[PDB]
Coordinates of C-alpha atoms (C1' of nucleotides) and ligand atoms in Angstrom, one line a residue:
Chain A
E3 CA 75.6 115.1 99.2
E4 CA 76.8 115.8 95.7
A5 CA 78.6 119.2 95.5
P6 CA 80.2 121.2 92.7
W7 CA 83.9 120.8 92.0
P8 CA 86.3 121.9 93.3
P9 CA 86.6 120.4 96.8
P10 CA 87.8 122.3 99.9
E11 CA 91.4 121.9 101.0
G12 CA 92.1 118.7 102.9
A13 CA 89.5 116.7 101.0
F14 CA 90.1 113.0 100.2
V15 CA 90.6 112.2 96.6
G16 CA 89.3 109.3 94.5
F17 CA 90.4 108.5 91.0
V18 CA 90.1 105.9 88.3
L19 CA 92.8 104.9 85.9
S20 CA 92.5 103.1 82.5
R21 CA 95.3 100.8 83.7
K22 CA 97.3 100.1 86.9
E23 CA 100.6 101.9 85.8
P24 CA 100.3 105.6 86.5
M25 CA 102.9 106.6 83.9
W26 CA 100.9 104.9 81.2
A27 CA 97.3 105.4 82.5
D28 CA 94.5 107.6 81.2
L29 CA 92.9 109.4 84.1
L30 CA 89.3 108.4 83.5
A31 CA 87.7 110.1 86.5
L32 CA 88.5 112.2 89.6
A33 CA 86.5 113.1 92.7
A34 CA 87.0 114.3 96.2
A35 CA 85.2 113.9 99.6
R36 CA 85.0 116.0 102.7
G37 CA 82.5 117.1 105.4
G38 CA 79.6 115.1 104.1
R39 CA 80.0 116.2 100.5
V40 CA 81.3 114.5 97.3
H41 CA 82.7 116.6 94.5
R42 CA 83.0 115.1 91.0
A43 CA 85.3 116.7 88.5
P44 CA 83.7 117.4 85.1
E45 CA 87.1 117.0 83.4
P46 CA 89.7 115.0 85.4
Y47 CA 92.9 116.3 83.8
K48 CA 92.1 120.0 84.3
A49 CA 90.6 119.3 87.7
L50 CA 93.9 117.9 88.7
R51 CA 95.3 121.4 88.7
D52 CA 92.9 122.3 91.5
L53 CA 94.4 120.0 94.1
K54 CA 97.1 120.9 96.7
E55 CA 97.9 117.3 97.7
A56 CA 96.8 113.8 96.8
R57 CA 95.2 112.5 100.0
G58 CA 93.5 109.1 99.8
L59 CA 93.9 105.5 98.7
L60 CA 96.8 105.0 96.3
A61 CA 97.8 108.7 96.7
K62 CA 101.3 108.0 95.3
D63 CA 99.9 106.8 91.9
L64 CA 97.8 109.9 91.4
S65 CA 100.9 112.0 92.3
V66 CA 103.0 110.1 89.7
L67 CA 100.4 110.9 87.1
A68 CA 100.3 114.5 88.1
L69 CA 104.1 114.7 87.9
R70 CA 103.8 113.2 84.4
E71 CA 101.6 116.1 83.4
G72 CA 104.1 118.6 84.8
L73 CA 102.1 119.2 88.0
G74 CA 103.7 119.3 91.4
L75 CA 101.1 117.4 93.4
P76 CA 102.6 115.6 96.4
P77 CA 100.9 112.6 98.0
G78 CA 99.9 112.9 101.7
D79 CA 97.8 110.6 103.9
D80 CA 97.0 107.2 102.4
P81 CA 94.9 104.7 104.3
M82 CA 96.8 101.9 102.5
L83 CA 99.9 102.9 104.4
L84 CA 98.1 102.9 107.8
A85 CA 96.7 99.4 107.1
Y86 CA 100.0 98.1 105.9
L87 CA 101.7 99.2 109.1
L88 CA 98.9 97.6 111.2
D89 CA 99.4 94.3 109.3
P90 CA 101.6 94.0 106.2
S91 CA 99.2 91.3 104.8
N92 CA 97.1 94.4 104.0
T93 CA 98.4 94.9 100.4
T94 CA 95.4 95.7 98.2
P95 CA 92.7 98.3 98.4
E96 CA 90.1 95.5 97.7
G97 CA 91.2 93.7 100.8
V98 CA 91.8 96.8 103.0
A99 CA 88.3 98.1 102.1
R100 CA 86.6 94.8 103.0
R101 CA 88.5 94.6 106.2
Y102 CA 88.2 98.2 107.4
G103 CA 84.7 99.3 106.3
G104 CA 83.8 99.6 102.6
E105 CA 84.1 98.3 99.1
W106 CA 86.7 99.1 96.5
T107 CA 84.6 100.0 93.4
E108 CA 85.3 101.4 89.9
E109 CA 83.7 104.8 90.6
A110 CA 85.8 107.9 91.6
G111 CA 83.3 109.4 93.9
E112 CA 82.8 106.2 95.8
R113 CA 86.6 105.8 96.0
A114 CA 86.9 109.3 97.5
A115 CA 84.2 108.5 100.0
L116 CA 85.9 105.2 100.8
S117 CA 89.2 106.9 101.4
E118 CA 87.7 109.3 103.9
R119 CA 85.9 106.6 105.8
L120 CA 88.9 104.2 105.8
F121 CA 91.2 106.9 107.0
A122 CA 89.1 107.7 110.0
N123 CA 88.7 104.1 111.0
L124 CA 92.4 103.2 110.4
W125 CA 93.7 106.3 112.1
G126 CA 91.7 105.2 115.2
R127 CA 93.2 101.8 115.2
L128 CA 96.7 103.4 115.3
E129 CA 96.1 105.4 118.4
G130 CA 98.3 104.2 121.2
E131 CA 100.4 102.5 118.6
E132 CA 103.3 105.0 119.1
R133 CA 105.9 103.1 117.2
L134 CA 103.7 102.5 114.2
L135 CA 102.6 106.1 114.2
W136 CA 106.3 107.1 114.1
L137 CA 107.0 104.9 111.2
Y138 CA 104.0 106.4 109.4
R139 CA 104.9 110.1 110.0
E140 CA 108.7 109.8 109.8
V141 CA 109.1 107.1 107.1
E142 CA 106.1 105.9 105.1
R143 CA 104.2 109.1 104.4
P144 CA 107.3 111.1 103.4
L145 CA 108.7 108.2 101.5
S146 CA 105.6 108.0 99.3
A147 CA 106.6 111.5 98.0
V148 CA 110.1 110.4 97.2
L149 CA 108.8 107.3 95.4
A150 CA 106.5 109.4 93.3
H151 CA 109.4 111.5 92.1
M152 CA 111.5 108.4 91.4
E153 CA 108.7 106.8 89.3
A154 CA 108.0 109.9 87.3
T155 CA 111.8 110.5 86.6
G156 CA 112.6 107.1 85.1
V157 CA 116.0 105.7 83.9
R158 CA 117.7 106.1 80.5
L159 CA 118.1 102.8 78.5
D160 CA 120.4 102.2 75.5
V161 CA 117.7 100.7 73.2
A162 CA 119.7 100.2 70.1
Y163 CA 122.3 98.4 72.1
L164 CA 119.7 96.0 73.4
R165 CA 118.1 95.5 70.0
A166 CA 121.6 94.5 68.6
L167 CA 122.2 92.2 71.6
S168 CA 118.9 90.4 70.9
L169 CA 120.0 89.3 67.4
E170 CA 123.3 88.0 68.7
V171 CA 121.8 86.1 71.6
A172 CA 119.1 84.6 69.2
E173 CA 121.9 83.0 67.1
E174 CA 123.6 81.5 70.2
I175 CA 120.3 80.1 71.5
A176 CA 119.8 78.4 68.1
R177 CA 123.2 76.7 68.5
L178 CA 122.3 75.4 71.9
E179 CA 118.8 74.3 70.9
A180 CA 120.0 72.5 67.8
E181 CA 122.6 70.6 69.9
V182 CA 120.1 69.6 72.6
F183 CA 117.7 68.3 69.9
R184 CA 120.5 66.2 68.3
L185 CA 121.4 64.7 71.7
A186 CA 117.8 64.0 72.5
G187 CA 117.4 62.3 69.1
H188 CA 114.4 64.5 68.2
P189 CA 113.1 68.1 68.5
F190 CA 110.7 69.1 71.3
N191 CA 109.7 72.3 73.2
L192 CA 112.9 73.0 75.2
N193 CA 110.9 75.7 77.0
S194 CA 108.5 73.2 78.4
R195 CA 109.8 71.7 81.7
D196 CA 107.2 69.0 81.3
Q197 CA 108.6 67.8 77.9
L198 CA 112.2 68.2 79.2
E199 CA 111.4 66.0 82.2
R200 CA 110.3 63.1 80.0
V201 CA 113.4 63.5 77.8
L202 CA 115.9 63.5 80.6
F203 CA 114.4 61.0 83.0
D204 CA 112.3 58.7 80.8
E205 CA 113.9 58.8 77.3
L206 CA 117.5 59.3 78.4
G207 CA 118.6 57.3 81.5
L208 CA 119.2 60.1 84.0
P209 CA 118.3 59.7 87.7
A210 CA 115.7 62.1 88.9
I211 CA 116.9 63.7 92.1
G212 CA 114.1 65.9 93.6
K213 CA 110.4 66.5 93.1
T214 CA 108.5 69.8 92.6
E215 CA 106.5 71.3 95.5
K216 CA 102.9 71.5 94.4
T217 CA 102.5 68.7 91.9
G218 CA 105.4 66.4 92.7
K219 CA 106.9 66.1 89.2
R220 CA 110.5 65.3 88.8
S221 CA 112.4 68.6 89.0
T222 CA 114.5 69.9 86.2
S223 CA 115.7 72.9 88.3
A224 CA 119.3 74.2 88.0
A225 CA 120.0 72.6 91.3
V226 CA 119.1 69.2 89.8
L227 CA 120.8 69.9 86.5
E228 CA 124.0 71.0 88.2
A229 CA 124.1 67.7 90.1
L230 CA 123.9 66.0 86.6
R231 CA 126.7 68.0 84.8
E232 CA 128.7 64.8 84.4
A233 CA 125.8 62.4 83.7
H234 CA 125.2 63.4 80.1
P235 CA 126.5 66.1 77.7
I236 CA 122.9 67.4 77.2
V237 CA 122.7 68.8 80.8
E238 CA 125.4 71.5 80.3
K239 CA 123.7 72.6 77.1
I240 CA 120.3 72.9 78.8
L241 CA 121.8 75.0 81.6
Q242 CA 123.3 77.4 79.0
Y243 CA 120.0 77.4 77.1
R244 CA 118.2 78.3 80.3
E245 CA 120.5 81.2 81.1
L246 CA 120.2 82.7 77.6
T247 CA 116.5 82.4 77.2
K248 CA 115.8 83.6 80.7
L249 CA 117.7 86.8 80.0
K250 CA 116.4 87.3 76.5
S251 CA 112.7 86.8 77.3
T252 CA 112.8 88.7 80.6
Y253 CA 115.1 91.7 79.9
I254 CA 116.6 92.0 76.4
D255 CA 113.4 91.8 74.4
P256 CA 110.8 93.4 76.7
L257 CA 112.6 96.4 78.0
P258 CA 113.2 98.3 74.8
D259 CA 109.4 98.3 74.1
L260 CA 108.7 100.1 77.4
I261 CA 110.4 103.4 76.7
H262 CA 107.9 106.2 77.5
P263 CA 107.0 108.3 74.4
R264 CA 107.2 111.6 76.4
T265 CA 110.2 111.2 78.7
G266 CA 112.3 108.8 76.5
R267 CA 113.0 106.8 79.7
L268 CA 112.0 103.5 81.4
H269 CA 109.6 103.9 84.3
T270 CA 109.1 101.3 87.0
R271 CA 106.6 101.3 89.9
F272 CA 107.8 101.2 93.5
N273 CA 105.2 99.3 95.5
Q274 CA 105.0 100.5 99.1
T275 CA 102.6 98.0 100.5
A276 CA 103.6 94.8 98.8
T277 CA 105.8 92.7 101.1
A278 CA 105.5 90.9 104.4
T279 CA 108.7 92.5 105.8
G280 CA 108.5 96.1 104.9
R281 CA 110.7 96.0 101.8
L282 CA 109.7 97.9 98.7
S283 CA 109.0 96.0 95.5
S284 CA 109.3 97.0 91.9
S285 CA 107.0 96.1 89.0
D286 CA 105.9 96.9 85.4
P287 CA 108.8 96.5 84.8
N288 CA 110.7 95.1 87.8
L289 CA 114.0 97.0 87.9
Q290 CA 115.1 95.4 91.2
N291 CA 116.2 92.2 89.4
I292 CA 118.2 93.4 86.5
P293 CA 121.0 90.8 85.9
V294 CA 124.5 91.4 87.1
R295 CA 126.2 88.1 87.9
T296 CA 126.9 86.4 84.5
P297 CA 128.8 87.8 81.5
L298 CA 125.5 88.2 79.6
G299 CA 123.8 89.6 82.7
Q300 CA 126.6 92.2 82.9
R301 CA 126.1 93.1 79.3
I302 CA 122.4 93.8 80.0
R303 CA 123.2 95.9 83.0
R304 CA 125.4 98.1 80.8
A305 CA 122.3 99.2 78.9
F306 CA 121.2 101.3 81.9
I307 CA 123.0 104.6 81.3
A308 CA 123.1 108.2 82.5
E309 CA 121.7 111.1 80.5
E310 CA 124.2 113.0 78.5
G311 CA 126.1 115.4 80.7
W312 CA 125.3 113.3 83.8
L313 CA 126.7 110.3 85.7
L314 CA 125.1 107.5 87.6
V315 CA 126.1 107.1 91.3
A316 CA 125.5 103.7 92.8
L317 CA 125.6 103.3 96.6
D318 CA 125.4 99.9 98.3
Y319 CA 125.3 99.0 102.0
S320 CA 127.9 96.4 102.7
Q321 CA 126.3 93.3 104.4
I322 CA 123.5 95.4 105.9
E323 CA 121.4 92.4 107.1
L324 CA 124.4 90.8 108.8
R325 CA 125.2 94.2 110.5
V326 CA 121.5 94.4 111.6
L327 CA 121.8 90.8 112.9
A328 CA 124.9 91.8 115.0
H329 CA 122.9 94.8 116.5
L330 CA 119.7 92.8 117.2
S331 CA 121.5 89.8 118.6
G332 CA 124.2 91.7 120.5
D333 CA 126.8 89.0 119.7
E334 CA 130.2 90.3 120.8
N335 CA 132.3 88.4 118.3
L336 CA 130.1 89.5 115.4
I337 CA 130.1 93.1 116.6
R338 CA 133.8 92.9 117.0
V339 CA 134.3 91.8 113.4
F340 CA 132.4 94.8 112.1
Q341 CA 133.7 97.4 114.6
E342 CA 137.2 96.5 113.4
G343 CA 136.5 97.3 109.8
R344 CA 137.6 93.8 108.7
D345 CA 136.3 91.9 105.7
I346 CA 133.2 90.2 107.1
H347 CA 133.4 87.0 105.1
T348 CA 137.2 86.5 105.4
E349 CA 137.1 87.4 109.0
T350 CA 134.2 84.9 109.7
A351 CA 136.3 82.3 107.8
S352 CA 139.1 83.0 110.3
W353 CA 136.9 82.4 113.3
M354 CA 135.7 79.1 111.9
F355 CA 138.4 76.9 110.4
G356 CA 140.6 78.4 113.1
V357 CA 143.1 80.1 110.9
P358 CA 144.4 83.7 110.8
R359 CA 143.1 85.9 108.0
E360 CA 145.6 86.0 105.1
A361 CA 145.6 82.2 105.5
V362 CA 141.9 82.2 104.5
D363 CA 141.7 80.5 101.1
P364 CA 139.3 81.3 98.3
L365 CA 137.1 78.3 99.1
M366 CA 137.1 79.0 102.8
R367 CA 135.8 82.6 102.2
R368 CA 133.1 81.2 100.0
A369 CA 131.9 78.8 102.7
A370 CA 131.8 81.7 105.3
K371 CA 130.0 84.0 102.9
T372 CA 127.4 81.4 102.0
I373 CA 126.8 80.7 105.7
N374 CA 126.8 84.4 106.5
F375 CA 123.7 84.9 104.2
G376 CA 122.3 81.4 104.8
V377 CA 122.0 81.8 108.5
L378 CA 119.5 84.7 107.8
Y379 CA 117.2 82.3 106.0
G380 CA 117.5 79.2 108.2
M381 CA 119.7 77.4 105.6
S382 CA 120.1 73.7 106.5
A383 CA 123.2 71.6 106.3
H384 CA 121.7 69.7 103.4
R385 CA 121.2 72.9 101.4
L386 CA 124.7 74.2 102.3
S387 CA 126.2 70.8 101.2
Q388 CA 124.6 71.3 97.8
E389 CA 125.5 74.9 97.5
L390 CA 129.2 74.4 98.2
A391 CA 129.3 70.9 96.7
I392 CA 130.8 69.4 99.9
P393 CA 130.0 66.3 101.9
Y394 CA 126.9 66.6 104.1
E395 CA 129.0 66.0 107.2
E396 CA 131.4 68.8 106.3
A397 CA 128.4 71.1 105.9
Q398 CA 127.1 70.1 109.3
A399 CA 130.5 70.9 110.8
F400 CA 130.7 74.3 109.2
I401 CA 127.2 75.3 110.5
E402 CA 128.1 74.2 114.1
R403 CA 131.4 76.1 114.0
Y404 CA 129.5 79.2 112.9
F405 CA 127.1 79.2 115.9
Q406 CA 130.0 78.4 118.2
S407 CA 131.8 81.5 117.0
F408 CA 128.7 83.6 117.2
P409 CA 126.7 82.0 120.0
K410 CA 124.3 84.9 120.6
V411 CA 122.9 84.6 117.1
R412 CA 121.3 81.3 117.9
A413 CA 120.1 82.7 121.2
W414 CA 118.5 85.6 119.4
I415 CA 116.8 83.3 116.9
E416 CA 115.4 81.2 119.7
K417 CA 114.2 84.2 121.7
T418 CA 112.6 85.7 118.7
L419 CA 110.6 82.6 117.9
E420 CA 109.5 82.2 121.5
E421 CA 108.2 85.7 121.7
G422 CA 106.6 85.3 118.3
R423 CA 104.8 82.2 119.4
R424 CA 103.4 84.1 122.4
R425 CA 102.4 87.4 120.8
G426 CA 101.6 86.0 117.3
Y427 CA 103.9 88.5 115.6
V428 CA 107.5 89.5 115.3
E429 CA 108.9 93.0 114.9
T430 CA 111.8 95.1 113.5
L431 CA 114.0 97.5 115.4
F432 CA 111.5 100.3 114.7
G433 CA 108.5 98.2 115.7
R434 CA 107.2 97.2 112.2
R435 CA 105.2 94.0 112.8
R436 CA 104.5 90.8 110.9
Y437 CA 101.9 88.3 112.1
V438 CA 103.0 84.7 111.9
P439 CA 100.3 82.4 113.2
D440 CA 101.7 79.1 111.9
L441 CA 104.5 79.2 114.6
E442 CA 102.3 76.7 116.4
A443 CA 101.4 74.5 113.5
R444 CA 101.3 70.8 114.4
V445 CA 102.8 69.8 111.1
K446 CA 106.6 70.1 111.5
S447 CA 107.4 71.2 107.9
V448 CA 104.8 73.9 108.1
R449 CA 105.8 75.1 111.5
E450 CA 109.5 75.2 110.7
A451 CA 108.9 77.1 107.4
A452 CA 106.9 79.6 109.6
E453 CA 109.9 79.9 112.0
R454 CA 112.3 80.8 109.1
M455 CA 109.8 83.5 107.9
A456 CA 109.5 84.7 111.5
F457 CA 113.1 85.2 112.5
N458 CA 114.2 86.5 109.1
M459 CA 111.6 89.3 109.3
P460 CA 113.2 91.5 112.0
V461 CA 116.5 91.4 110.1
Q462 CA 115.2 92.0 106.6
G463 CA 112.6 94.4 107.9
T464 CA 115.0 96.5 110.0
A465 CA 117.4 96.7 107.0
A466 CA 114.4 97.9 104.9
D467 CA 113.4 100.5 107.6
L468 CA 117.0 101.8 107.6
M469 CA 117.1 102.1 103.8
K470 CA 113.7 103.9 103.7
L471 CA 114.8 106.3 106.4
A472 CA 117.9 107.0 104.4
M473 CA 115.9 107.8 101.2
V474 CA 113.7 110.2 103.2
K475 CA 116.8 112.0 104.6
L476 CA 118.7 112.0 101.3
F477 CA 116.0 113.1 98.9
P478 CA 115.8 116.8 99.9
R479 CA 119.6 117.0 99.8
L480 CA 119.7 115.7 96.2
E481 CA 117.0 118.2 95.1
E482 CA 119.1 121.0 96.5
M483 CA 122.1 119.8 94.4
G484 CA 120.1 119.3 91.2
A485 CA 120.6 115.5 91.4
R486 CA 117.9 112.8 91.0
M487 CA 117.1 109.6 92.8
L488 CA 116.4 106.8 90.2
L489 CA 116.2 103.4 91.8
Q490 CA 116.3 101.5 95.0
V491 CA 117.3 97.9 95.1
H492 CA 116.8 96.9 98.7
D493 CA 120.3 97.8 100.0
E494 CA 121.4 99.9 97.1
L495 CA 120.4 103.3 95.6
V496 CA 121.1 104.5 92.1
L497 CA 121.3 108.3 91.6
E498 CA 121.8 110.5 88.6
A499 CA 123.9 113.7 89.0
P500 CA 125.2 116.4 86.7
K501 CA 128.9 115.6 85.9
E502 CA 130.3 118.6 87.6
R503 CA 128.6 117.6 90.9
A504 CA 128.7 113.8 90.8
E505 CA 131.7 113.6 93.1
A506 CA 130.1 115.9 95.7
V507 CA 126.8 114.0 95.4
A508 CA 128.5 110.7 95.9
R509 CA 130.3 111.8 99.0
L510 CA 127.2 113.4 100.5
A511 CA 124.9 110.4 99.7
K512 CA 127.5 108.0 101.3
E513 CA 127.5 110.1 104.5
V514 CA 123.7 110.3 104.7
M515 CA 123.4 106.6 104.2
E516 CA 126.2 105.6 106.7
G517 CA 124.8 107.9 109.4
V518 CA 121.1 107.2 108.9
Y519 CA 120.7 105.5 112.3
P520 CA 123.7 104.6 114.3
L521 CA 123.8 100.9 115.4
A522 CA 126.2 99.0 117.7
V523 CA 128.2 98.4 114.5
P524 CA 129.1 100.9 111.8
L525 CA 127.2 100.9 108.5
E526 CA 129.6 100.8 105.5
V527 CA 128.6 102.0 102.1
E528 CA 130.4 101.3 98.8
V529 CA 130.0 104.0 96.2
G530 CA 130.8 104.1 92.5
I531 CA 130.3 106.6 89.7
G532 CA 129.9 105.8 86.1
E533 CA 128.3 106.3 82.7
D534 CA 126.4 103.0 83.1
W535 CA 125.0 101.0 86.0
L536 CA 127.6 98.3 85.8
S537 CA 130.6 100.7 85.6
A538 CA 129.0 102.7 88.5
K539 CA 129.2 99.6 90.8
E540 CA 132.9 99.4 90.0
Chain B
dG1 C1' 92.3 88.6 74.7
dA2 C1' 92.4 87.5 79.7
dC3 C1' 92.9 84.6 84.1
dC4 C1' 95.2 81.1 86.8
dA5 C1' 98.9 77.7 89.0
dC6 C1' 103.2 76.1 88.6
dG7 C1' 108.1 75.6 88.0
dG8 C1' 111.7 78.0 87.4
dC9 C1' 115.0 81.9 88.1
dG10 C1' 116.5 86.9 88.0
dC11 C1' 117.8 90.3 92.1
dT12 C1' 118.6 91.8 97.3
Chain C
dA1 C1' 113.2 71.9 104.6
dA2 C1' 114.1 84.8 103.6
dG3 C1' 111.6 88.5 100.4
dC4 C1' 109.9 89.6 95.8
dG5 C1' 108.0 89.9 90.1
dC6 C1' 108.1 87.9 85.5
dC7 C1' 108.9 84.4 82.2
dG8 C1' 106.7 80.3 79.3
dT9 C1' 103.7 76.3 79.6
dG10 C1' 99.6 74.1 80.2
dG11 C1' 94.8 74.7 81.1
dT12 C1' 90.9 77.4 81.0
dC13 C1' 87.3 80.9 80.0
Ligands
TTP1 C1 124.8 85.7 98.3 C2 123.7 86.6 98.7 C3 123.8 88.0 98.4 N1 122.7 88.7 98.8 C4 122.7 90.2 98.5 C5 123.4 90.9 99.7 C6 124.4 91.9 99.1 C7 124.2 91.7 97.6 C8 125.6 91.5 96.9 O1 126.1 90.2 97.2 P1 127.7 90.0 97.3 O2 128.4 91.1 96.6 O3 128.0 88.7 96.7 O4 127.9 90.0 98.8 P2 129.1 90.7 99.6 O5 129.3 92.1 99.0 O6 128.8 90.7 101.0 O7 130.3 89.7 99.2 P3 131.7 90.3 98.6 O8 132.5 90.8 99.8 O9 132.5 89.1 98.0 O10 131.5 91.3 97.6 O11 123.5 90.5 97.4 C9 121.6 88.2 99.5 O12 120.7 89.0 99.8 N2 121.5 86.9 99.7 C10 122.5 86.1 99.4 O13 122.4 84.8 99.6
MG2 MG1 129.8 92.4 97.0
MG3 MG1 105.1 81.4 92.4

DNA sequence: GACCACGGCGCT
DNA sequence: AAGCGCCGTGGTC
């Protein structure tokens, strides 16, 4: 059924890249399939110009490569997105092919044929699935186009600044390393947790608190080291060493080497079918975990800057997952807290502790805040105790007071788990599903871990759905204003706008995000503008 | 060179 | 006793 290039309109495309990252890949081959024919491009790059849309497996990646080459080729249907909506464990084309009727090979024509067959089969599985079809048409398919533009646009990085920082950090790492070795009485590989374990617990006389999950070694995690801050001077030094080497090896050193020759910018990938909950992920490099908490972390974040003549605009939803929880659970006291525009963590501290706000102390707000996020994950009293460094019994008390103030939260958790046990899956506000079979595991630890995954998903997933919908609504407004969407970090968007229009863009983006989908509580968005990512977050 | 599992840890 | 991706180590191929 081999036919001459080019294919008719509406054909499914297949393509092969020299490497997974579309901004860096050579397009090795290109083909298209339709109506019982397969068309193979004699020269892929030139053939790219013949296509109206990228329709097929991994359509976004081909679109990114096209945008890189100055071609406006938007992604359309992609069987990966259909499969992911059916079951978010469908994350790879290898797996999706095996499950839905083919094999993911290394040949373009075969990939084109596969895309066509998988689309037909998967489209059929979605029929009747009204809510999933709505997510596909109104969120996932249009979002893929937005993501392609974001990937191809990239973000500006101050490379010289990072190079300079590297040299300074190297000197400080040396000071810490040298002092650790002196305290140990000998040098060893401070990067090896296996060697460190022996030094701390065997050679020195330190008590080993916890064990590691898979192999049961004595843990040297920060949680353990923190508990040992007073046991020996070597511990604090190790904590400092860990912080510095983590940031140097993961951000300071690698990032400057990833600037693209043609754009002069750093380009991530936004993976659309990678998580169990419907969140996006980011890779090669991951720009969703750039440091921000510590002083050195903040120094790194300052390296992300706006193009000359432009500004960054950073918009963050305030406590979106807690607001989603209020809506899903219908808890009146939680809803009241938000509807009143009061500081969530301070206000929650008022409810527990039984004191008016203004009387809420710094430590009390901390407890409330830790609980406010912890409840989303199924955080236990033991864990809370360690996080706040308070007596186990105090931690227990705090958790009980929380559920006594917000009783419908516990009720929603229990209802969600019961329904999940029955149906075998849980769902977001929009109907995105996650299958969680271990809800009926006979091993308590396994079952309870499954429960925490299960009741978190509707919260995290609804928050993800809302952010995705916001991006889809916001993108065409930005293009009209000559602004750019650069990054998404789960509950935050980073935009780049010409200086003259930054204020207007910030106001507009804030309004689009706050009004994306009205809930029983208001969505609040914090917005900042600045020359670098840190200064744009205020 | 590449792959892996693991512990560990950065962000949401 | 939530969701990710990336680091170095140790082990392997
Ligand atoms: C602490 C914490 C934060 N986050 C995310 C949610 C948000 C983002 C920023 O965290 P914070 O700024 O620390 O949370 P916050 O804005 O609600 O608290 P504050 O009023 O003091 O500013 O990090 C989690 O997802 N899980 C957590 O446990
Ligand atoms: Mg905050
Ligand atoms: Mg792991």
